[PDB]
Amino acid sequence: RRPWYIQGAASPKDMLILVDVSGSVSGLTLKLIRTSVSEMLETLSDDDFVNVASFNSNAQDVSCFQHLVQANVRNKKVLKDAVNNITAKGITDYKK
């Protein structure tokens, strides 16, 4: 997980995290999803571009970004703050 290892292990990414916030993820699995998304964000650098989206019968962004962003310290902090606010309610729809 060190910056140099992650840099030398692959090339820059265009990551898009798609989080399931349907009703059935309510409980322990939602909390684990939040922690896992934060940990995955912890592995990205300034050459990588990331955005986090959620879907429950309708897909939308979790924050005020709406497209891929530079994934520097500030943008990652905004994404983490937005992710630690999602609630589980609705019906799953993978196609949307």
Partner: protein, 48 residues
């Protein structure tokens, strides 16, 4: 006066089985089977 009671017994057993295979889900979530069983509830309701 026909053996029409046995048909109702069998349809009651079918209704019980339909109730048993229903899977409760949290926070207004559903699956395909639950949607299918909801429509089937009209078949039992009209027969009864």
């Amino acid at each position: 006066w026909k053996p029409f009671e046995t048909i109702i017994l069998l349809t009651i057993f079918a209704n019980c089985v339909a109730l048993a295979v229903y899977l409760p889900m949290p926070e207004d979530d559903n699956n395909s089977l639950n949607l299918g069983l909801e429509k089937l509830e009209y078949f039992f309701l009209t027969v009864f």
